[PDB]
Design a protein around this ligand. Structure first.
Ligand SMILES: [Zn+2]
Ligand SMILES: [Zn+2]
Ligand SMILES: [Zn+2]
Length: 178
């Protein structure tokens, strides 16, 4: 197995996947690494198994159909993985914890949002459809762009939104377009 966490790239107390060489800190994995379960298979493996069991799941999909899907076990796992892929980027630090807003010339967002809040929401099964999760995710980046206006720091939101959207298209097999 790898000797660094797949998500944050640090060593530490790592749990090793039994079916692939990746390793994780307890709370870097999503869901948080399970207490028992021998063998244990990580989310990368669990997602690959879904694909292998239903190869047609990789045919193209319309976003609008994906969003209205109910959060059954497989869609729950897919959103957990997508969330994880965002945390995998070091720029996710800016969006992880609860933000605050005190900048001359700007007003904070009406509905603040952050990665850890989405993580908790998933963990507590608060989303009934994929739409709920995707909306909160895009809201993080939208809030950021609006608040930071012409400061160059707005670019961090563009950058992390691009990682989210690329991973969304891949995980949910959204039909490729020009
Ligand atoms: Zn980690
Ligand atoms: Zn694995
Ligand atoms: Zn099938």
């Amino acid at each position: 197995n790898s000797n660094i966490c797949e998500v944050c790239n640090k060593w530490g107390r790592l749990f090793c996947c039994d079916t692939c060489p990746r390793s994780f800190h307890e709370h870097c994995h999503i869901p948080s690494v399970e207490a028992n379960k021998n063998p244990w298979s990580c989310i990368f493996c669990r997602i690959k198994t879904i694909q292998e069991r239903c190869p047609e799941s990789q045919s193209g999909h319309q976003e609008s159909e994906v969003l209205m899907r109910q959060m059954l076990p497989e869609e729950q796992l897919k959103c957990e993985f997508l969330l994880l892929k965002v945390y995998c980027d070091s720029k996710s630090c800016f969006f992880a914890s609860e933000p605050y807003y005190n900048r001359e010339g700007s007003q904070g967002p009406q509905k603040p949002m952050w990665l850890n809040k989405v993580k908790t929401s998933l963990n507590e099964q608060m989303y009934t459809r994929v739409e709920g999760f995707v909306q909160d995710m895009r809201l993080i980046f939208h809030n950021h762009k609006e608040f930071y206006r012409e400061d160059k720091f707005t670019r961090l939101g563009i950058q992390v939104q691009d990682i989210f959207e690329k991973n969304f298209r891949n995980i949910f097999a959204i039909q490729e377009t020009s």
